[PDB]
Amino acid sequence: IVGGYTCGANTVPYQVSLNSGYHFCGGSLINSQWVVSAAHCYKSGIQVRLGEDNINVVEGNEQFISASKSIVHPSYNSNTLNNDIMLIKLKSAASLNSRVASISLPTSCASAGTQCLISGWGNTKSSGTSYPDVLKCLKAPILSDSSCKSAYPGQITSNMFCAGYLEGGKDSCQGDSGGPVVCSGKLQGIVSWGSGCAQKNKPGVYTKVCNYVSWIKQTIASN
């Protein structure tokens, strides 16, 4: 997260860290046994880490649970990043509490202008590399489809939305991938892509979660 703020320990209880020996992506806990992330975060050997603040120190609220299976969206295209969504099942159910909690799926799609919360442990510089160890947060509005398409000609599908600031300075970044965009207590987006981070006229692009609720529910119900 570039240009954000320190969230505060366990203030984003649905935020998870995906760890394969090291943090590589975020995700969102959507019930006691399932996480939603980006398809471009797919890899084998994933441990889901819940209740994290400092991802480098055991602070006492963590639950470390290995993934039993991953399910990438059947229509995911890694070139265009269309359908950039993946489900991850935990080997055992997380113990839910105030600091480890699921985030509800959307009943409706959020409109342009809606204020959302984007979070993650990604790079905090738009040119440097500095990785924070504590969770970072950014409040950002969803941008209009027209402005999003104008920012990225030929690349924005109906399964994507832009959020952030055309002026730059505030954005998600590398390592935030797969993490949540939450608006009014619902998961509306997944950190997906962009051109660099926090650059003028290149806002973050996010997977449009409301298009996938049926797939998510059916997949969970049979797996």
Ligand X SMILES: COc1cccc(CN)c1
Q: Which position among 204, 208, 212, 216 is part of the footprint of ligand X (CB under 6 A)?
A: 204
- Of 13 and 26, nearer to ligand X (C-beta) is 26
- Of 63 and 207, nearer to Ca ion (C-beta) is 63
Q: Which position among 119, 124, 177, 188 is part of the footprint of ligand X (CB under 6 A)?
A: 177
Binding flag, residue 174, ligand X (CB under 6 A): yes
Q: Choosing among Ca ion, ligand X, none, which partner's interface includes residue 219 (Cβ < 5 to 8 Å by kind)?
A: none
Burial class (CB in 10 A: 0-12, 13-18, 19+), 147: middle
Give me the 182-201 binding string for ligand X, x by CB under 6 A, dash otherwise.
---------x-xx-xx----
Annotated catalytic residue: which of 17, 37, 40, 73?
40
Active site residue 222: no
Amino acid at 131: Y
Binding flag, residue 28, ligand X (CB under 6 A): no
Active site residue 73: no
Q: Choosing among Ca ion, ligand X, none, which partner's interface includes residue 191 (Cβ < 5 to 8 Å by kind)?
A: ligand X
Whether 80 contacts 157, CB under 8 Å? yes
3-state secondary structure of 163: strand
Give the pair of three-digit tokens for residue 205. 């692009």
Strand partners, 206: 161, 191
* Chain center to CA of 155: 20
Q: Could you tell me where the DSSP H helices lie in the chain?
A: 145-151, 213-221
Residues at the contact surface with Ca ion, assessed by CB under 5 A: 52, 54, 59
Give me the 109-148 binding string for ligand X, x by CB under 6 A, dash otherwise.
----------------------------------------
Binding flag, residue 37, ligand X (CB under 6 A): no
d(CA 117, CA 14): 12
Active site residue 145: no
d(CA 105, CA 103): 7
3-state secondary structure of 41: helix
d(CA 172, CA 163): 10
Whether 112 contacts 150, CB under 8 Å? no
Q: List, by residue number, the catalytic residues.
A: 40, 84, 177
Annotated binding residues for Ca(2+): 52, 54, 57, 62
Q: Which residues bind ligand X (CB under 6 A)?
A: 171-174, 176-177, 191, 193-194, 196-197, 204
